[PDB]
Amino acid sequence: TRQMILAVGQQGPIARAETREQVVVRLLDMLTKAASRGANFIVFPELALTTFFPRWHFTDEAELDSFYETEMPGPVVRPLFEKAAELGIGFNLGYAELVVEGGVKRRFNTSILVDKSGKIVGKYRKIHLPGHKEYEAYRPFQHLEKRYFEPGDLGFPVYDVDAAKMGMFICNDRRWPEAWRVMGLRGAEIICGGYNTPTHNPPVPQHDHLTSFHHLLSMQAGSYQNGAWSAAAGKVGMEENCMLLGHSCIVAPTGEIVALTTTLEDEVITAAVDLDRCRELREHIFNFKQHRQPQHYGLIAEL
Amino acid sequence: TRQMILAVGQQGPIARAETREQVVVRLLDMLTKAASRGANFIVFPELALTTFFPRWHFTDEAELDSFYETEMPGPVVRPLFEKAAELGIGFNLGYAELVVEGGVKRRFNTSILVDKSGKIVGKYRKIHLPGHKEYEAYRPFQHLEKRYFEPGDLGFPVYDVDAAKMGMFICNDRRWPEAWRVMGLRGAEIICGGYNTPTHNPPVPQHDHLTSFHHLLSMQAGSYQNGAWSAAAGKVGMEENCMLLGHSCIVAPTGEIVALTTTLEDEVITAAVDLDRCRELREHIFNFKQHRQPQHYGLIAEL
Amino acid sequence: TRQMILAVGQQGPIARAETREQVVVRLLDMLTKAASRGANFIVFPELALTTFFPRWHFTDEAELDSFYETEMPGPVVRPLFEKAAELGIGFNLGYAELVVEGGVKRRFNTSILVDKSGKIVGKYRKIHLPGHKEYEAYRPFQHLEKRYFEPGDLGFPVYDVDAAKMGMFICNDRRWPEAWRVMGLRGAEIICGGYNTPTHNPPVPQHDHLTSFHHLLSMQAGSYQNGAWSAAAGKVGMEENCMLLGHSCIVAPTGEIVALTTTLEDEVITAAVDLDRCRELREHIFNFKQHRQPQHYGLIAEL
Amino acid sequence: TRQMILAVGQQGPIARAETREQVVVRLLDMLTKAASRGANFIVFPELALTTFFPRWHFTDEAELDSFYETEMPGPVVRPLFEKAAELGIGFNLGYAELVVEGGVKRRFNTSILVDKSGKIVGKYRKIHLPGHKEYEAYRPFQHLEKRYFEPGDLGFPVYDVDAAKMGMFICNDRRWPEAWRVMGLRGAEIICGGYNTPTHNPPVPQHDHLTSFHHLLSMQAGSYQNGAWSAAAGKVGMEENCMLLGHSCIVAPTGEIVALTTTLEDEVITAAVDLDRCRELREHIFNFKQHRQPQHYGLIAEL
């Protein structure tokens, strides 16, 4: 039938002291609510198991490490996978990943796709890390993602998830046309991910009142120009004195926003998705094989 | 001072029998009014010297050729260049180009940049030709650009126009992130062009009510993602029984629409442009050198 | 809890020859689908049991009368009421009403609210009839609502429907701030209705490309300024050679569009509704008792 | 000719210590630039001669009074009127009005219309005063307009200004459909005013990211529903540690935003205005005489 119901599980703030066990209870509730509304897949936020720690400068490595996952799923997150399999609803979960390879402690801002059987069918690691690497005094709050993570090493893959071709993006990635295009060329039908986007931008505060605008503009344009359904799940609200943007959403291949959250708390939204709708764009106005002229795009791939 | 006033000269319909002399009178009127409002550059539509002939299926080559320019400017168009130099206002003019090489005819959908001294300082040829190739009987009007024009052979260049770096796009090109990105990488501060966009699309009529949405979405996203000012000049209204989309516009590097037309007739709109505004994006959130990861965008350039 | 899930049942075209029995099958399918997605109420379109007959000029009264309901529900529509009661989902149904009172054949463009028990709990009759009364040759298609209906005689009432205060509007009514305000003053928490809105306006065709814009603008502003959730269910698509606007939607008290259709066929959309959310507006920025100054609004009620 | 060019003079922050002389220099600069761009009228912000003092809790009456005008224009403001007459450009100026009647002080948040001859041709006093009445300790900044001003006593008048019918609104007034409707009924062709709108609202912070949305939604709906051109001039930027919303704008009678500011500093925007454009709405879809049903709007005027 190539039909399904897609859901987004927006998260309200996660406190510094809030435990992973408490967070999983919240994730379970939304996954259950989504299933009750007929959803077959639910998108969760970026770094959805803890508070957004990149806002602080750490001096103790042990303390920094505590915010990362060394297993997936571990005993605490396991319940989410079991419930997903029980109710037949897959999900996209974001978390901080720590893996030791060749004597190096590698840190990634990661997301995984789990199918309706509870099996991990794909992983992606954030390639476009926003922010800075060194502590910057002029900022009211830090954004040290470049210091706490290294660029992803998996490229922008597209995976088969319960008969749907899905690609992942994480937060800032959604603002880069290149990320969307690579997955579009790989045939993605659904492009989804999560985000933590403060409504205040220290470097350019004159853009603060445009935060929602820029976020939604990026989702709509990406979907439209690649003929893909998309979804963005945000962790929102006042988290540790920093306001995070709401407006989690689901978008059609036409760029039309078909579902939008209106609260800054845990909230589930859903939308009926017809995977064949992608054809209205990809077989016509954006029929790549018939219209693209790659011989003129070389500069985009130059190092 | 990095400051200027940009204008867009929207054109109402141009009849099949309307002469180039009559069209020049209309173009001169708008160029003069823009200058009176302080503009230093005015953007005109795609194929701005004739009716949109690609809507018909031609069977006579002599008839087809009549809609093309064999020289630029010819005696009839020259007055526009002279007035531009007199008032100190450059312009972007679209037209059908016919070139004869060793007895072989080359056809392009073209646009040129003329500076405030009336000198041609740049050319661009439409790379993404929309529509179909063969005659399709069911359609109320055809769209045969692929038959009447060859894909441009100049790539997506960026030129110096009176101390402003300007890149050109033509109609359908504005829907392709690749076009915008190439010029963004080349340092464009202003990306502009014209269009003829019917509000009805025979193959996908279910998108007719989204014509304005898709047009504006493309302009906003392109500007924002590349931190560039942009402008789109349309030829609009009921032309030869085909309704063409209005909403000509000027957009800031933030994606904000700063000027918009509301009529479907010849109309001039203007906006103050600060070339240093591009930095709010290009030195921060979209600081290419610091954030882009071209090693992972290779597929975009693969033939 | 004051929580519920609201649904909209958009209808694709209804043919001149399509029977009420066939239409009810379609309505039943959507009501069933909505219930499966957890909805407790579903909004159907204006004149949802037949093709939009006001587009034609009738000379035979018997033929005109055939498009009206003399009972509600009659044997053919009864199944919809039974299913609603079975599944616990109320609905808003629009239809043409014919009633003889005091020797006069009264014709109304009507809508009724049916609760989750299948009981009719309220009626409304369209007060703002758009279009004209006499045949007008210059129009490609007629809009004789003023000829086939008389203004409603029930005012703009607000009813208690399963613990929710609901007010009704029909089509054109949504464009009048007075309609929304009267229901807002009566405490409406949900304001809903249906519509048949052609994408072509004979009197002012220069507004054709703004059809979606004007429709959505009206819904968003109405909701925001009255702190009410709202929903608009359209009968859409190409019906008898006349294209009808899509974009059926559900809107939050903040004016945010939380659900939107993307096809021009029978389509169900849903959204979680928190009746207390109305307080964010009605107890603050739009706290009527604290901010309204009726002594200066007299002209609005002058005859 | 029913034609003119309308301008908006957005103001960047005005410091607590910034003198009226310094502010007039800034106002003169914008009025002169607007004239150079062909404008015949320029709209200035609400309380455009001082910092937004209602953000503080005053304990000294002499201090409060210092922010009010006891005459209009006084020697310091006179130069603005003289230049307006010289260049032929009228304006809408907002200021705090202090009147002494029989030894009793009357306080109003006021705006006046000055024609191109420099003559005061109309006055309006803010009717919908937003905010709270008592000091609220938890708030980072107060909003005590209800304490420092009396509700206007002039109603919502419409005046003749150089052959244009103009109505005035002030800040919060733009959110009330009643204000717009009264002036629409009085035949306003242009409805304009200024505003000071913080991007943060202490009691309902969950609406902070919607500040621009609510502002623009109000302007678009008001214009469309009344078939009137409109303009909103804001005093914006970080003023005394409080961020004020930018996005000053000019809107067509169709609800289309034709001009928008993008900076948070003194900025001039302009737009061509055709007074007969109002007819596209007022003689058709919103032809009051033909469509309105005031006999059913009574509740709106009930005290």
Side-chain angles (χ1 to χ4, degrees), chain A residues 191-215:
Chain A
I191 290 176
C192 62
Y195 63 90
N196 284 273
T197 303
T199 50
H200 173 58
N201 176 63
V204 188
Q206 55 264 49
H207 289 182
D208 284 4
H209 59 296
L210 300 176
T211 305
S212 168
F213 172 65
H214 285 159
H215 157 63

PDB file of all heavy atoms in Angstrom, chain A residues 191-215:
ATOM      1  N   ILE A 191      12.940  11.878   5.324  1.00  0.00           N
ATOM      2  CA  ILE A 191      14.193  12.398   5.858  1.00  0.00           C
ATOM      3  C   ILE A 191      13.815  12.955   7.226  1.00  0.00           C
ATOM      4  O   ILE A 191      12.998  13.867   7.330  1.00  0.00           O
ATOM      5  CB  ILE A 191      14.770  13.503   4.939  1.00  0.00           C
ATOM      6  CG1 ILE A 191      15.262  12.872   3.631  1.00  0.00           C
ATOM      7  CG2 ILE A 191      15.897  14.238   5.644  1.00  0.00           C
ATOM      8  CD1 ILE A 191      15.774  13.867   2.596  1.00  0.00           C
ATOM      9  N   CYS A 192      14.389  12.399   8.288  1.00  0.00           N
ATOM     10  CA  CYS A 192      14.015  12.854   9.619  1.00  0.00           C
ATOM     11  C   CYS A 192      15.153  12.958  10.616  1.00  0.00           C
ATOM     12  O   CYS A 192      16.234  12.417  10.402  1.00  0.00           O
ATOM     13  CB  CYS A 192      12.931  11.935  10.182  1.00  0.00           C
ATOM     14  SG  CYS A 192      13.453  10.215  10.383  1.00  0.00           S
ATOM     15  N   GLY A 193      14.888  13.663  11.710  1.00  0.00           N
ATOM     16  CA  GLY A 193      15.888  13.850  12.746  1.00  0.00           C
ATOM     17  C   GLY A 193      15.374  14.729  13.874  1.00  0.00           C
ATOM     18  O   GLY A 193      14.216  15.152  13.851  1.00  0.00           O
ATOM     19  N   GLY A 194      16.234  15.007  14.852  1.00  0.00           N
ATOM     20  CA  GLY A 194      15.850  15.828  15.990  1.00  0.00           C
ATOM     21  C   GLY A 194      16.691  17.086  16.132  1.00  0.00           C
ATOM     22  O   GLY A 194      17.640  17.290  15.371  1.00  0.00           O
ATOM     23  N   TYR A 195      16.369  17.927  17.109  1.00  0.00           N
ATOM     24  CA  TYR A 195      17.131  19.160  17.288  1.00  0.00           C
ATOM     25  C   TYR A 195      16.988  19.820  18.652  1.00  0.00           C
ATOM     26  O   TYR A 195      16.013  19.599  19.371  1.00  0.00           O
ATOM     27  CB  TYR A 195      16.726  20.178  16.213  1.00  0.00           C
ATOM     28  CG  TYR A 195      15.270  20.620  16.284  1.00  0.00           C
ATOM     29  CD1 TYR A 195      14.880  21.730  17.045  1.00  0.00           C
ATOM     30  CD2 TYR A 195      14.277  19.912  15.604  1.00  0.00           C
ATOM     31  CE1 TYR A 195      13.528  22.119  17.125  1.00  0.00           C
ATOM     32  CE2 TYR A 195      12.931  20.288  15.681  1.00  0.00           C
ATOM     33  CZ  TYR A 195      12.564  21.389  16.440  1.00  0.00           C
ATOM     34  OH  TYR A 195      11.230  21.747  16.509  1.00  0.00           O
ATOM     35  N   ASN A 196      17.996  20.623  18.982  1.00  0.00           N
ATOM     36  CA  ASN A 196      18.057  21.435  20.194  1.00  0.00           C
ATOM     37  C   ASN A 196      18.495  22.778  19.617  1.00  0.00           C
ATOM     38  O   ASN A 196      19.678  22.985  19.347  1.00  0.00           O
ATOM     39  CB  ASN A 196      19.123  20.916  21.163  1.00  0.00           C
ATOM     40  CG  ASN A 196      18.684  19.668  21.900  1.00  0.00           C
ATOM     41  OD1 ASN A 196      18.048  19.744  22.957  1.00  0.00           O
ATOM     42  ND2 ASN A 196      19.010  18.509  21.341  1.00  0.00           N
ATOM     43  N   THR A 197      17.542  23.681  19.409  1.00  0.00           N
ATOM     44  CA  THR A 197      17.844  24.980  18.819  1.00  0.00           C
ATOM     45  C   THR A 197      17.458  26.152  19.716  1.00  0.00           C
ATOM     46  O   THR A 197      16.284  26.513  19.814  1.00  0.00           O
ATOM     47  CB  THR A 197      17.115  25.127  17.466  1.00  0.00           C
ATOM     48  OG1 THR A 197      17.491  24.043  16.604  1.00  0.00           O
ATOM     49  CG2 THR A 197      17.465  26.464  16.801  1.00  0.00           C
ATOM     50  N   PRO A 198      18.446  26.763  20.388  1.00  0.00           N
ATOM     51  CA  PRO A 198      18.155  27.897  21.269  1.00  0.00           C
ATOM     52  C   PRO A 198      17.524  29.044  20.487  1.00  0.00           C
ATOM     53  O   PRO A 198      17.851  29.253  19.317  1.00  0.00           O
ATOM     54  CB  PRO A 198      19.531  28.275  21.812  1.00  0.00           C
ATOM     55  CG  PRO A 198      20.266  26.969  21.813  1.00  0.00           C
ATOM     56  CD  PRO A 198      19.870  26.390  20.468  1.00  0.00           C
ATOM     57  N   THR A 199      16.626  29.786  21.131  1.00  0.00           N
ATOM     58  CA  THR A 199      15.986  30.912  20.461  1.00  0.00           C
ATOM     59  C   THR A 199      16.841  32.178  20.547  1.00  0.00           C
ATOM     60  O   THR A 199      16.447  33.242  20.067  1.00  0.00           O
ATOM     61  CB  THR A 199      14.559  31.176  21.016  1.00  0.00           C
ATOM     62  OG1 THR A 199      14.593  31.250  22.446  1.00  0.00           O
ATOM     63  CG2 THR A 199      13.614  30.055  20.592  1.00  0.00           C
ATOM     64  N   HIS A 200      18.016  32.057  21.162  1.00  0.00           N
ATOM     65  CA  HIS A 200      18.952  33.179  21.258  1.00  0.00           C
ATOM     66  C   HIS A 200      20.271  32.763  20.620  1.00  0.00           C
ATOM     67  O   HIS A 200      20.818  31.706  20.943  1.00  0.00           O
ATOM     68  CB  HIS A 200      19.212  33.590  22.714  1.00  0.00           C
ATOM     69  CG  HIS A 200      20.289  34.627  22.862  1.00  0.00           C
ATOM     70  ND1 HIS A 200      20.232  35.858  22.242  1.00  0.00           N
ATOM     71  CD2 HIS A 200      21.458  34.606  23.548  1.00  0.00           C
ATOM     72  CE1 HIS A 200      21.318  36.550  22.538  1.00  0.00           C
ATOM     73  NE2 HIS A 200      22.079  35.813  23.328  1.00  0.00           N
ATOM     74  N   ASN A 201      20.768  33.595  19.711  1.00  0.00           N
ATOM     75  CA  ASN A 201      22.023  33.340  19.012  1.00  0.00           C
ATOM     76  C   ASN A 201      23.026  34.433  19.372  1.00  0.00           C
ATOM     77  O   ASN A 201      22.993  35.531  18.812  1.00  0.00           O
ATOM     78  CB  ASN A 201      21.792  33.336  17.500  1.00  0.00           C
ATOM     79  CG  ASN A 201      23.078  33.170  16.716  1.00  0.00           C
ATOM     80  OD1 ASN A 201      23.755  32.147  16.818  1.00  0.00           O
ATOM     81  ND2 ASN A 201      23.423  34.177  15.930  1.00  0.00           N
ATOM     82  N   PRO A 202      23.934  34.144  20.315  1.00  0.00           N
ATOM     83  CA  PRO A 202      24.952  35.100  20.762  1.00  0.00           C
ATOM     84  C   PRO A 202      25.713  35.830  19.650  1.00  0.00           C
ATOM     85  O   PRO A 202      25.832  37.055  19.679  1.00  0.00           O
ATOM     86  CB  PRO A 202      25.861  34.241  21.635  1.00  0.00           C
ATOM     87  CG  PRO A 202      24.891  33.281  22.251  1.00  0.00           C
ATOM     88  CD  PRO A 202      24.041  32.879  21.064  1.00  0.00           C
ATOM     89  N   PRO A 203      26.235  35.090  18.657  1.00  0.00           N
ATOM     90  CA  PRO A 203      26.982  35.710  17.554  1.00  0.00           C
ATOM     91  C   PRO A 203      26.163  36.701  16.727  1.00  0.00           C
ATOM     92  O   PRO A 203      26.673  37.737  16.298  1.00  0.00           O
ATOM     93  CB  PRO A 203      27.420  34.510  16.713  1.00  0.00           C
ATOM     94  CG  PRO A 203      27.472  33.390  17.702  1.00  0.00           C
ATOM     95  CD  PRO A 203      26.239  33.623  18.525  1.00  0.00           C
ATOM     96  N   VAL A 204      24.895  36.374  16.501  1.00  0.00           N
ATOM     97  CA  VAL A 204      24.016  37.223  15.707  1.00  0.00           C
ATOM     98  C   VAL A 204      22.624  37.290  16.327  1.00  0.00           C
ATOM     99  O   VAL A 204      21.675  36.691  15.818  1.00  0.00           O
ATOM    100  CB  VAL A 204      23.900  36.685  14.266  1.00  0.00           C
ATOM    101  CG1 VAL A 204      23.138  37.672  13.398  1.00  0.00           C
ATOM    102  CG2 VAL A 204      25.288  36.428  13.696  1.00  0.00           C
ATOM    103  N   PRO A 205      22.483  38.033  17.437  1.00  0.00           N
ATOM    104  CA  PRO A 205      21.203  38.180  18.135  1.00  0.00           C
ATOM    105  C   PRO A 205      20.105  38.863  17.321  1.00  0.00           C
ATOM    106  O   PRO A 205      18.924  38.747  17.654  1.00  0.00           O
ATOM    107  CB  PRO A 205      21.585  38.965  19.390  1.00  0.00           C
ATOM    108  CG  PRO A 205      22.735  39.803  18.922  1.00  0.00           C
ATOM    109  CD  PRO A 205      23.537  38.827  18.094  1.00  0.00           C
ATOM    110  N   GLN A 206      20.486  39.566  16.255  1.00  0.00           N
ATOM    111  CA  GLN A 206      19.501  40.243  15.416  1.00  0.00           C
ATOM    112  C   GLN A 206      18.674  39.252  14.600  1.00  0.00           C
ATOM    113  O   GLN A 206      17.795  39.649  13.839  1.00  0.00           O
ATOM    114  CB  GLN A 206      20.173  41.257  14.475  1.00  0.00           C
ATOM    115  CG  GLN A 206      21.271  40.691  13.594  1.00  0.00           C
ATOM    116  CD  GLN A 206      22.654  40.892  14.186  1.00  0.00           C
ATOM    117  OE1 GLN A 206      22.889  40.591  15.356  1.00  0.00           O
ATOM    118  NE2 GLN A 206      23.580  41.397  13.374  1.00  0.00           N
ATOM    119  N   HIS A 207      18.964  37.963  14.755  1.00  0.00           N
ATOM    120  CA  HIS A 207      18.218  36.915  14.055  1.00  0.00           C
ATOM    121  C   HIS A 207      17.345  36.131  15.037  1.00  0.00           C
ATOM    122  O   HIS A 207      16.656  35.189  14.643  1.00  0.00           O
ATOM    123  CB  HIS A 207      19.159  35.916  13.373  1.00  0.00           C
ATOM    124  CG  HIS A 207      19.877  36.457  12.176  1.00  0.00           C
ATOM    125  ND1 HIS A 207      20.728  35.683  11.413  1.00  0.00           N
ATOM    126  CD2 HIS A 207      19.878  37.687  11.611  1.00  0.00           C
ATOM    127  CE1 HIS A 207      21.223  36.414  10.430  1.00  0.00           C
ATOM    128  NE2 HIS A 207      20.724  37.633  10.527  1.00  0.00           N
ATOM    129  N   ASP A 208      17.370  36.514  16.309  1.00  0.00           N
ATOM    130  CA  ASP A 208      16.596  35.804  17.326  1.00  0.00           C
ATOM    131  C   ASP A 208      15.110  35.638  17.021  1.00  0.00           C
ATOM    132  O   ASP A 208      14.551  34.558  17.224  1.00  0.00           O
ATOM    133  CB  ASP A 208      16.756  36.485  18.691  1.00  0.00           C
ATOM    134  CG  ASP A 208      18.091  36.182  19.347  1.00  0.00           C
ATOM    135  OD1 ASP A 208      18.932  35.507  18.715  1.00  0.00           O
ATOM    136  OD2 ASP A 208      18.293  36.622  20.503  1.00  0.00           O
ATOM    137  N   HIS A 209      14.467  36.702  16.545  1.00  0.00           N
ATOM    138  CA  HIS A 209      13.040  36.638  16.245  1.00  0.00           C
ATOM    139  C   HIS A 209      12.739  35.860  14.961  1.00  0.00           C
ATOM    140  O   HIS A 209      11.578  35.728  14.568  1.00  0.00           O
ATOM    141  CB  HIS A 209      12.450  38.056  16.155  1.00  0.00           C
ATOM    142  CG  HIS A 209      13.093  38.918  15.110  1.00  0.00           C
ATOM    143  ND1 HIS A 209      14.415  39.304  15.171  1.00  0.00           N
ATOM    144  CD2 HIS A 209      12.599  39.446  13.966  1.00  0.00           C
ATOM    145  CE1 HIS A 209      14.708  40.031  14.108  1.00  0.00           C
ATOM    146  NE2 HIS A 209      13.623  40.133  13.360  1.00  0.00           N
ATOM    147  N   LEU A 210      13.783  35.340  14.318  1.00  0.00           N
ATOM    148  CA  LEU A 210      13.621  34.569  13.085  1.00  0.00           C
ATOM    149  C   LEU A 210      13.888  33.084  13.323  1.00  0.00           C
ATOM    150  O   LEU A 210      13.883  32.291  12.386  1.00  0.00           O
ATOM    151  CB  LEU A 210      14.595  35.066  12.009  1.00  0.00           C
ATOM    152  CG  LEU A 210      14.481  36.525  11.558  1.00  0.00           C
ATOM    153  CD1 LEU A 210      15.586  36.855  10.558  1.00  0.00           C
ATOM    154  CD2 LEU A 210      13.113  36.758  10.943  1.00  0.00           C
ATOM    155  N   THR A 211      14.108  32.702  14.573  1.00  0.00           N
ATOM    156  CA  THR A 211      14.429  31.309  14.874  1.00  0.00           C
ATOM    157  C   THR A 211      13.437  30.283  14.333  1.00  0.00           C
ATOM    158  O   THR A 211      13.842  29.310  13.686  1.00  0.00           O
ATOM    159  CB  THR A 211      14.625  31.112  16.382  1.00  0.00           C
ATOM    160  OG1 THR A 211      15.626  32.031  16.838  1.00  0.00           O
ATOM    161  CG2 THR A 211      15.106  29.693  16.682  1.00  0.00           C
ATOM    162  N   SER A 212      12.147  30.492  14.580  1.00  0.00           N
ATOM    163  CA  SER A 212      11.142  29.560  14.076  1.00  0.00           C
ATOM    164  C   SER A 212      11.151  29.601  12.550  1.00  0.00           C
ATOM    165  O   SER A 212      11.148  28.564  11.886  1.00  0.00           O
ATOM    166  CB  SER A 212       9.751  29.938  14.589  1.00  0.00           C
ATOM    167  OG  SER A 212       8.748  29.220  13.884  1.00  0.00           O
ATOM    168  N   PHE A 213      11.162  30.812  12.003  1.00  0.00           N
ATOM    169  CA  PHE A 213      11.178  31.007  10.560  1.00  0.00           C
ATOM    170  C   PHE A 213      12.294  30.215   9.869  1.00  0.00           C
ATOM    171  O   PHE A 213      12.039  29.484   8.912  1.00  0.00           O
ATOM    172  CB  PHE A 213      11.327  32.508  10.250  1.00  0.00           C
ATOM    173  CG  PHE A 213      11.554  32.817   8.793  1.00  0.00           C
ATOM    174  CD1 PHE A 213      10.570  32.554   7.849  1.00  0.00           C
ATOM    175  CD2 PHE A 213      12.758  33.378   8.367  1.00  0.00           C
ATOM    176  CE1 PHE A 213      10.775  32.845   6.496  1.00  0.00           C
ATOM    177  CE2 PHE A 213      12.975  33.671   7.019  1.00  0.00           C
ATOM    178  CZ  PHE A 213      11.981  33.404   6.083  1.00  0.00           C
ATOM    179  N   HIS A 214      13.527  30.359  10.351  1.00  0.00           N
ATOM    180  CA  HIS A 214      14.666  29.668   9.743  1.00  0.00           C
ATOM    181  C   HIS A 214      14.581  28.149   9.842  1.00  0.00           C
ATOM    182  O   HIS A 214      14.964  27.436   8.911  1.00  0.00           O
ATOM    183  CB  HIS A 214      15.972  30.177  10.361  1.00  0.00           C
ATOM    184  CG  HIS A 214      16.368  31.537   9.874  1.00  0.00           C
ATOM    185  ND1 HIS A 214      17.228  32.359  10.571  1.00  0.00           N
ATOM    186  CD2 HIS A 214      16.053  32.199   8.735  1.00  0.00           C
ATOM    187  CE1 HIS A 214      17.427  33.469   9.880  1.00  0.00           C
ATOM    188  NE2 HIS A 214      16.725  33.397   8.762  1.00  0.00           N
ATOM    189  N   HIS A 215      14.065  27.665  10.964  1.00  0.00           N
ATOM    190  CA  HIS A 215      13.892  26.234  11.198  1.00  0.00           C
ATOM    191  C   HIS A 215      12.855  25.667  10.225  1.00  0.00           C
ATOM    192  O   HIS A 215      13.132  24.714   9.492  1.00  0.00           O
ATOM    193  CB  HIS A 215      13.463  26.016  12.658  1.00  0.00           C
ATOM    194  CG  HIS A 215      12.738  24.728  12.909  1.00  0.00           C
ATOM    195  ND1 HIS A 215      13.318  23.491  12.724  1.00  0.00           N
ATOM    196  CD2 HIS A 215      11.488  24.491  13.372  1.00  0.00           C
ATOM    197  CE1 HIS A 215      12.456  22.548  13.063  1.00  0.00           C
ATOM    198  NE2 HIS A 215      11.338  23.128  13.462  1.00  0.00           N
TER     199      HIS A 215
END
